[PDB]
Design a protein around this ligand. Structure first.
Ligand SMILES: *[C@@H]1CC(=O)N(CC)C1=O
Ligand SMILES: *[C@@H]1CC(=O)N(CC)C1=O
Ligand SMILES: *[C@H]1CC(=O)N(CC)C1=O
Ligand SMILES: *[C@H]1CC(=O)N(CC)C1=O
Lengths: 306, 306
């Protein structure tokens, strides 16, 4: 037993990370088959990034202005094109270590692992959640753009995120692997505001179930509320409203622990109004919303991957 | 910027994990060169584990009673021996993916990554700290024994931990790769008590420096204390005493931020007596002691590995 903010094993992703240089700008790219994917602002200079005209900038570039290195092995660029906010560089070699993979656009509240990289080389791995305002609260230094986020399904990698920028507020924004930004952000250096960040209620609930599974039950109370009246309290504290799909997703956690979703909601209700009063839950003095119901089930049953 | 509890990339370790079976007991082993390392309680039955006589049990076993699988590839066991609490199985094949590696016995308070495994297959990765009482607070289910903890130094893996058992209290105990337990635990199913768990003061201090680096400075106060008088407060709250080596290790964090170690100690002093009063620091409502000074420097400068 025990409970940890666990990330997916990163081995299959390490072998896909390359270093992309264009001009004096260097960042990370993702090498699958014979295509290298990277942020298109790699073609920007320091001055260009305030008001970049990407089509006009991309015109001045030819295949040989792009240097791609995979460790010590040089790749040769044969074609290049812009798909939304990512560049696709066709190279002469297919990545031998290309894993079975898929591109996926995740939804707010889902979780994934980030492999933070510099100069094409892997630095560290952490788990995080797509916030409801389509940002992530990550850990990125200069040079980490093109680092990717991913899930693993047995032997299959699902790439869902590419890092593009840090907002003046210290949070992080990026795209899917087709280059569409998550959220209303653009790849230019201007003031851009994220919305109100809210708490992911269904994840908190999944975490309470994890805590019951692991011996923390002090917060269980003898009260039963309704969905309307919980959501009425939820909205007051900047919590995402709970819907029926959310209750359905929690069904197996309900079944394994004998506690109805609505009863768990009533416990959360009380913590929101009264607080935790110094106590802790699974080690934490705050409510935690970076585990999905699937994460809890995976962790508490020991799902593995190739 | 930002700050995350980051783990090391696990790729180099994934390729070393095999599945070891003896009788009906299956667990994980570590395959480096032509030796497989695993917990010796693999040779125990369900009844044996209360009062195991390992030498007498190991006598009834021969090379062919040990089945080692690396994915679908079977390994053949040629020799076998017991070194303290680990078994060493000599196999006929050297692991092709053997990375440059070293065995190391870490000290309490150092951190490392755990690759949690089942049936020889990688499940997930998390960072943790060796507590001062030589336990770790991990996330392990039945079948995870022989999972290992490790650090990476550029292209070199430092194995420091092998998982052996969960205590009746829900915490986790294990050995180095030479089979010596960390702490006074034995590999038998009896009540074993860990000592008092204390907080790792030098790590907390490193984390305060990280927080100053990332914009959290509300806890900075205009007070200066002495080492004796801080330690006198430290011991009252179950904090590890601070020594001069500890102050020396923090020197570069002091230099980069302009804040003297002793001044930071005085800030911590106040949080210990007064609390955080609802506020948070780097996202957390508790003081955090699972980052070493080296972790903070690595994260805040973007150190990478092969
Ligand atoms: C993994 C491998 C693959 O092609 N798929 C299809 C959806 C996977 O899920
Ligand atoms: C990594 C590779 C190796 O043999 N060493 C010696 C200490 C390392 O640090
Ligand atoms: C990485 C991401 C980013 O914004 N830059 C500046 C050009 C990088 O190099
Ligand atoms: C893994 C670790 C442990 O104690 N067991 C029971 C025999 C395992 O199989």
């Amino acid at each position: 037993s025990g409970f940890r903010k666990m990330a997916f094993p990163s081995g299959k992703v390490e072998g896909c990370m390359v270093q992309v240089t264009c001009g004096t700008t260097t960042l990370n790219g993702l090498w699958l088959d014979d295509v290298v994917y990277c942020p298109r602002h790699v073609i920007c200079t320091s001055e260009d990034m305030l008001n970049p005209n990407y089509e006009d900038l991309l015109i001045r570039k030819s295949n040989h202005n792009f240097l791609v290195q995979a460790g010590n092995v040089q790749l040769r660029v044969i074609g290049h094109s812009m798909q939304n906010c990512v560049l696709k560089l066709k190279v002469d070699t297919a990545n031998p270590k290309t894993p079975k993979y898929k591109f996926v656009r995740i939804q707010p509240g889902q979780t994934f692992s980030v492999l933070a990289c510099y100069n094409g080389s892997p630095s560290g791995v952490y788990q995080c959640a797509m916030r409801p305002n389509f940002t992530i609260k990550g850990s990125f230094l200069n040079g980490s753009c093109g680092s990717v986020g991913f899930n693993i399904d047995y032997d299959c990698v699902s790439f869902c995120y590419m890092h593009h920028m840090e907002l003046p507020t210290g949070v992080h924004a990026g795209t899917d692997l087709e280059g569409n930004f998550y959220g209303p952000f653009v790849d230019r250096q201007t003031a851009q505001a994220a919305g109100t960040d809210t708490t992911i209620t269904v994840n908190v609930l999944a975490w309470l179930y994890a805590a019951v599974i692991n011996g923390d039950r002090w917060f269980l109370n003898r009260f039963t509320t309704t969905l309307n009246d919980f959501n009425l309290v939820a909205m007051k504290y900047n919590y995402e409203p709970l819907t029926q799909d959310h209750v359905d997703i929690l069904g197996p956690l309900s079944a394994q622990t004998g506690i109805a979703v609505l009863d768990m909601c009533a416990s959360l209700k009380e913590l929101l109004q009264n607080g935790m009063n110094g106590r802790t839950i699974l080690g934490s003095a705050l409510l935690e919303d970076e585990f999905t119901p699937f994460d809890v089930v995976r962790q508490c049953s020991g799902v593995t991957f190739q």
